[PDB]
Amino acid sequence: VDFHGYARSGIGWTGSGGEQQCFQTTGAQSKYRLGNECETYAELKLGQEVWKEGDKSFYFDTNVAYSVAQQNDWEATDPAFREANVQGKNLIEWLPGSTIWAGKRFYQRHDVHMIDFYYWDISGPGAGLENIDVGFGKLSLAATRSSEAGGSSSFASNNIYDYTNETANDVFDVRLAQMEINPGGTLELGVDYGRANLRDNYRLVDGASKDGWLFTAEHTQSVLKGFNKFVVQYATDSMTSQGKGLSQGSGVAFDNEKFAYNINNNGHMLRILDHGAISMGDNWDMMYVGMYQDINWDNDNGTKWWTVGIRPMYKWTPIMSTVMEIGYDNVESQRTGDKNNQYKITLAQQWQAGDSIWSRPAIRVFATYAKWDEKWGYDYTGNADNNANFGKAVPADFNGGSFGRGDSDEWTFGAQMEIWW
Amino acid sequence: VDFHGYARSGIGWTGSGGEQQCFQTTGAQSKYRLGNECETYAELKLGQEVWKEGDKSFYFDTNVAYSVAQQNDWEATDPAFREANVQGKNLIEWLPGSTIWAGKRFYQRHDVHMIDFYYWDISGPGAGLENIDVGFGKLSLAATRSSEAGGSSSFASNNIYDYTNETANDVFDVRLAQMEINPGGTLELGVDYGRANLRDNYRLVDGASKDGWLFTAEHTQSVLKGFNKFVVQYATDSMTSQGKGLSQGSGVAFDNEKFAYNINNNGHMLRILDHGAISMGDNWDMMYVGMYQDINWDNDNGTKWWTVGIRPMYKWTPIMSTVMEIGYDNVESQRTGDKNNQYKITLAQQWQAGDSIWSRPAIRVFATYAKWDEKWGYDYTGNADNNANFGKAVPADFNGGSFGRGDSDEWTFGAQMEIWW
Amino acid sequence: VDFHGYARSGIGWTGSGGEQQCFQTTGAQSKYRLGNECETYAELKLGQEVWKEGDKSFYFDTNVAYSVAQQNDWEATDPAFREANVQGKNLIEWLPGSTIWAGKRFYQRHDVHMIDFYYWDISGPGAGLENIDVGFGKLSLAATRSSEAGGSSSFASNNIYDYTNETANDVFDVRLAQMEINPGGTLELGVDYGRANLRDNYRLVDGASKDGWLFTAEHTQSVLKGFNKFVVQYATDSMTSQGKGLSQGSGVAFDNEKFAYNINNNGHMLRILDHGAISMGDNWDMMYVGMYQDINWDNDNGTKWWTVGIRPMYKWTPIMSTVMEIGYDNVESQRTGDKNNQYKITLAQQWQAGDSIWSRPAIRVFATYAKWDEKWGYDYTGNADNNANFGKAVPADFNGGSFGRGDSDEWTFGAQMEIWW
């Protein structure tokens, strides 16, 4: 039994009073993590190599994930059961070093750690054949699934409230990885294709996106005792909404009161992303991100997002460091052309296992200052039946309402544990 | 710390579209399971030998069970807390070999693996004295509890809806096991007795069954590198409805909208079951089942079930095999005399941790075909207050409605992992 | 990976019929717990020392807790994510022997085992610095959080029902432990200060306690192969209601229908407690408790509690003992001056892992007798909206109702396990 995982927990305060506020720009899909995580998250993996004969082996792996509010000792919660898979390694005699796998799995996820952002991720129930040698790189193929909570009807209608039956979406990939291009630099290329999957006689809404494509190209360059990753992704239609490689094809979303409304995913997403971590001399490590994400949809409800962040670390002695994180977001509405923006400055003293920017457990004591200006938000006034602008981007002062977090600053402070193992 | 358990997970499709359909005959209590499990299910057990001195020890064991629908990554669910027991070996000097135990435990469950069917199983919160030597065999004695969600009233009434207080049931066993009866064959005999248990002044409905008996005789014969188990079980009254060891004595069941309704369970069950697994030379194995089950109740709502299945395995290499499963169900209604019937043909290719038909993990790729014809179903139209036929077996065409899955066929295909460790 | 925890589970009966009932005096905050636990409870901790260099290390710890009814095998439940923290030992250069920590944690909890009563407990989300050596003793410092489910309003109002927003409470610890004092004795002194913490513009109800103090002094004396603990605690205002070190500054509670009601906790608590465990020879051990707790509130709804209990254990042979527990509770109502009382006598035969009264795993077979006499209870008739006496102590016969459990007596029996590892 092999024990691995990730956990974060802590205690924080807000300068105006109360418990810790979390700062995320309205219309942005992520937040600069340092001193800006307001939840206790823990995911626990119990694995084992359960059989081995020479080079051939079977590995078993699980994951149970807990999310709680960090407000009380006794916090009851639904645990999320996220993995349960068997991996058969080097087991197909005419394909050396391949892994055959089936079950529920985190499958080759790619993230930007300082903003907590998975940019490519098709994790789920699935099966596949991974790490096929083609003599110049590695080829991996899987089939995986997600579902939309409704969006399908058992009869043809023009009323959206009939479309309440669950919609399975299947994703099929090809990943071609580890291609040597330049000395010290590698290329990874992926194509993910997704589609809604319907039982016979079942029907999606008219104009539903229904299927869609995602194309990923990543260059990874070894540099300065660390690396630079440069990522370009293009996606169409049913892959736009998630924007990570899981498909949503119905175009239907659900209210709290269980009314159904249209969110239609036709159009395209362009993502251009640079990130990495480097060491400068021996006393400084620095982690960084720059991203442009453009979502263009035929219903005009898309967003255009710029994110720029740097995280320099200074090392005083091997186990003790000072970390600063400076980030700036700009989010433009397609619908109105207005702009929401935020900058966050976090300064923290950190004790950690080993001397690296990546090495953890880490114990942090921090102070965060955040200044935002938001001039548009999403209309969620009333409910979907009541409101024709439900789920749509609108100005801050729209119709005498208040949308977005307006213009204000705030500052938070506290202490945090973070570990992976 | 000792890590043991069971898990199954996968991904599948249906030939007419959508996610994997699961095929079970209306009125049958089990399903032929190769390529016909649609659930991600895992049981995770953490044990330890906490104290050991000489021949004596205290073993501690737990079980946490997760069931999710295998449609997304983030699947939140209630975990079922199924075990937490302490087992004390050789602590009674004058009963050597014996185990005393108390707490929540899976106590000596007996199943047929290819249909996922427990035929003897009194598992629950309990306590007992296990594996006493009587010189010619082994004797084990326990007491366990189950409950029924209502069925008890605190006052004298003739109204069914007043019987909403929970009904505790006590189960007490005598298991006399491992007796040599012929060369290479052993006999096990069981008597399980159970009753409803009421708080003072409380009561069940007039004509409630209240208490009941289960009598089990099992012969285990070693043949052809495996075994044949031949099982005869007779049960009466409160034991009939649950059908495998736990008393249900109230006779009252509950609607979705929380209307109580009288089912009753007076009468008898006869189960005759033959099953096992054998090896037919080096390259061939087979597991097999034949079962007759007769449930006869004074309210006419019983069922008469015939089921028969075979599962040949062919070995190509020590770790790669082809599995065929052929199963047939026929279920006759006591109430109408009509018959529901289904046959299933599944062909699968699998990779497995060693040569044996019992070797796990196994990673499968499968294709399943199922043909059914159903002429009776259970009436669940409306609710118990507005429908007098609620929970009763009715013809397929009853009132011009549709009951049971009619006359149809379908096929499914996919990939699956099955593991115990 | 290190696997540790606590668990208890069993099966029992009541002499008048049914499952096992649990006996606790109306207005008492604990129950004499040998043969008087009706819950399957398990806490499962997975720890690991994940980095070690010289004296220094980082230790990671977890706790997930399950509490289920012990009525069936399949008991679904919300697990409580109680704890998840990292502890950095010997990291700080000029504070040798000190530990820094952050996350959800069980922090310095002191209990009386025979009544299951934590008398000092500030556990929760937090962070701290502990075991700072000051040469004559050790200093420990922490900050932890607890949160009330409502009690805060975002606008100015005199309406109690407008106070529905959560109220964060922050607790600040100073513990000075391990003082030399006398041959074979030692002393710990603690001061905990707690306060409600509000988001800007928000408010609590008029006259709400808002902040408060706990003052703890504990002397521990080594005596007769075991120990005595003598505890004096005094608390004021917001610390009184929880009574163990977590402030509740709102003064607001909620009924099932979600009507807010005022339970104001201004005033003071005095607790005097004596407990311990000793060996009176080779074959005789005993555990004991005596306590006086007086809660005096300005709304007259406090309670005045006397309790005393002894638990002698006779050892026949090293693994088998006979345990008796005799306890007496008396609770006086501040509001009425009436008295509720109970005496419980439990006799049990125990097998346990070793020859100490603290040795567990333990398997117990028991019989418990209890008589109670109750002259007052709490009014929970109707809702907080329609009953002006809601949540308040009233005579047993109030308006011809029945409040408290009257005069009665009963006996329970069965078997249970209790383990820690």
Residue numbers in the entry:
A (entry chain C), B (entry chain A), C (entry chain B): 1 to 421
Paper text:
In this work, we set out to determine the applicability of GROMACS density-guided simulations to automatically refine a membrane protein system. Using adaptive force density-guided simulations as implemented in the GROMACS molecular dynamics package, we show how automated model refinement of a membrane protein is achieved without the need to manually tune the fitting force ad hoc. The proposed protocol was used to refine models into a new cryo-EM density of the membrane protein maltoporin, either in a lipid bilayer or detergent micelle, and we found that results do not substantially differ from fitting in solution. Fitted structures satisfied classical model-quality metrics and improved the quality and the model-to-map correlation of the x-ray starting structure. Fitting performed well in detergent, lipids, or solution, offering simpler options for fully automated simulation protocols. We also present selection criteria to choose the best-fit model that balances stereochemistry and goodness of fit. Additionally, the density-guided fitting in combination with generalized orientation-dependent all-atom potential was used to correct the pixel-size estimation of the experimental cryo-EM density map. In addition to identifying a robust parameter set and model-quality metrics for refinement of membrane proteins, we report an improved estimation of the pixel size of cryo-EM data based on goodness of fit and stereochemistry of simulated models.
